Design a protein around this ligand. Structure first.
Ligand SMILES: *Cc1cc2c(cc1C)Nc1c([nH]c(=O)[nH]c1=O)N2C[C@H](O)[C@H](O)[C@H](O)COP(=O)(O)OP(=O)(O)OC[C@H]1O[C@@H](n2cnc3c(N)ncnc32)[C@H](O)[C@@H]1O
Length: 530
């Protein structure tokens, strides 16, 4: 059942409680509920997404930013980046899978094999992931000549139709520039190639969000309880340090209500909110906890550390002809390319947008247009690392989010980003684009030297919206990895984390499908443990 008023819930005890009904959390809860002998509650601060067309219609996603569906986290002042940048985070069923552009990627097998081989996460490799991606998807490319793909999973992936003539021309221009058309999600990593994406969207235009895919079909299921509009402020522990539940607050008076879990609690509130919720519960770096008066239950120096992202630049152009009036999600093509020889993974990815993107360029006086297109390069394996810290002991205060963009000591992130701008301009200047590409609006042709392009990036960069890794899994004996390879929070029992915060290293591609895969794996870890 769906419960949007806690006063309507009489039994507040479950076998499992999943906190956060986002990309991973909806997956974990759906999959746990598949055992009819088990009771599952999924707790979500935002509202039910059922019948909210602004959330369900994928082509409207850009309107969700800074709406009532966005927690809206601005960042701390940036030493070498853009202090005006905001981390949009969805506050609704489905989480960010309910606000995103639905770009859908299997992670490179080389990213996933490294989790085990390089970052200590025993059991986390392509072998473990491959069957989970197949289970989770129904993919338009499924068939006997691509047997890795799923044809029955709840998450529908489809090919973006190549209708946009500017995008067709852009791909022709990539080819002229030495970047061929490539198939995505074949299981072989695209190092140098470009194409229209696969998107996780249904035929009727509805996003195939985690809530749509896993949760709408089971809302009436006997052993499953969905609680929306309720915000976890603290996890509850035994004298034995067994997590026994969560304190949640209603939206009416802000009273606190306790829910109890008999087996496990699963925290899935995402890379920004999960570290905050663990810190509020006494799990985190001891000295940081003490600065806010919080009793330390576990000194877990890695909580809130290792924040990773795909920082993103922009090159905008006037179009010489009318741009498309309709689209799947306005950001329909991706281009991968290496800036260096000998890579098994692209170090640079660019999105092509059939709209101007002047969120961070207008305040610096760059001209804009109502008819143009954007190329947005992003650094796939950024080496900068930031933090998420408490702003106070009050759960209602937004956390301090400091990604430290472009601070890696070797200047890697900034180097790749300058090369991405130069590459975006090289592609837009190919013969196949000559009847599309007008004036470069930003950074503009007066910006040519490494210094000018660095100064532009520092001012105008954005994010792909891919924060990860603030509560990472790692070796049982690594003190900086708050989780063991089974996703259990070290130092307490009965508690696991499953969302983007677990990644020990970012993946090369847009991470959503991977985060749902992480949900699917957590459910299996749980089911096998009992
Ligand atoms: C916001 C964003 C992110 C993505 C795109 C765009 C934008 C604007 N586009 C995109 C993405 N990924 C792709 O692969 N392709 C794309 O085109 N984005 C990133 C991806 O969308 C996110 O990385 C991924 O969903 C993160 O998943 P998650 O780690 O499971 O986190 P969610 O935010 O999905 O779920 C958290 C969930 O918990 C609720 N919450 C937060 N705090 C609380 C508390 N205290 N109590 C209860 N519930 C809480 C949130 O409301 C949210 O629903």
């Amino acid at each position: 059942m769906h419960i949007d008023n806690i006063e309507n819930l009489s039994d507040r005890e479950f076998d499992y409680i999943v906190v956060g009904g986002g990309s991973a959390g909806a997956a974990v809860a759906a999959r746990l509920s598949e055992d009819p002998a088990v009771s599952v509650a999924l707790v979500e601060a935002g509202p039910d997404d059922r019948g909210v067309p602004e959330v369900l219609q994928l082509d409207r996603w850009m309107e969700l930013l800074e709406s009532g569906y966005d927690w809206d986290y601005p960042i701390e002042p940036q030493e070498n980046g853009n202090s005006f940048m905001r981390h949009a985070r969805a506050k609704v069923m489905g989480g960010c899978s309910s606000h995103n552009s639905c770009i859908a990627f299997w992670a490179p097998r080389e990213d996933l094999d490294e989790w085990e081989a390089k970052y200590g996460a025993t059991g986390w490799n392509a072998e473990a992931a491959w069957p989970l991606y197949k289970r989770l998807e129904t993919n338009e490319d499924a068939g006997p000549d691509a047997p890795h793909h799923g044809d029955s999973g709840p998450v529908h992936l489809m090919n973006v139709p190549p209708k946009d003539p500017t995008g067709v021309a852009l791909l022709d221009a990539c080819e002229q520039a030495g970047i061929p058309r490539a198939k995505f999600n074949t299981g072989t990593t695209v190092v140098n190639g470009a194409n229209f994406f696969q998107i996780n969207r249904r035929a009727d235009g509805t996003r195939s969000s985690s809530s749509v895919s896993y949760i709408h079909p089971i809302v009436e299921q006997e052993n499953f309880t969905l609680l929306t509009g309720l915000r976890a402020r603290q996890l509850v522990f035994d004298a034995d340090r067994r997590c026994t539940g969560v304190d949640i607050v209603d939206s009416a008076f802000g009273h606190t209500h306790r829910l109890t879990a008999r087996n496990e609690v699963v925290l899935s509130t995402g890379a920004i909110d999960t570290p905050k919720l663990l810190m509020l519960s006494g799990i985190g770096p001891a000295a940081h906890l003490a600065e806010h008066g919080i009793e330390v239950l576990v000194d877990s120096p890695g909580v809130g550390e290792h924040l990773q992202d795909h920082p993103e630049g922009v090159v905008q152009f006037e179009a010489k002809q009318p741009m498309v009036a309709e689209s799947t999600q306005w950001w329909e093509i991706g281009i991968f390319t290496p800036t260096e020889d000998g890579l098994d993974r692209p170090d640079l990815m660019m999105h092509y947008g059939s709209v101007p993107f002047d969120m961070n360029t207008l305040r610096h006086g760059y001209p804009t247009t109502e008819n143009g297109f954007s190329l947005t390069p992003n650094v796939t394996h950024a080496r900068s690392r930031g933090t998420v810290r408490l702003r106070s002991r009050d759960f209602r205060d937004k956390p301090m989010v400091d990604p430290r963009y472009f601070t890696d000591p070797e200047g890697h992130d900034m180097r790749v980003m300058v090369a991405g701008i130069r590459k975006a301009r090289e592609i837009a200047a190919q013969p196949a684009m000559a009847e599309w590409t007008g004036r470069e609006l930003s950074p503009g042709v007066e910006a040519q030297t490494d210094e000018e392009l660095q100064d532009y990036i520092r001012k105008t960069h954005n994010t792909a919206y891919h924060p990860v890794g603030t509560v990472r899994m790692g070796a049982v004996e690594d003190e900086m990895s708050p989780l063991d390879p089974e996703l259990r929070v070290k130092g307490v029992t009965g508690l696991r984390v499953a969302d983007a915060s677990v990644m020990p290293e970012h993946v090369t591609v847009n991470p959503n499908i991977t985060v749902m895969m992480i949900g699917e794996r957590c459910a299996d870890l749980i089911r096998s443990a009992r």
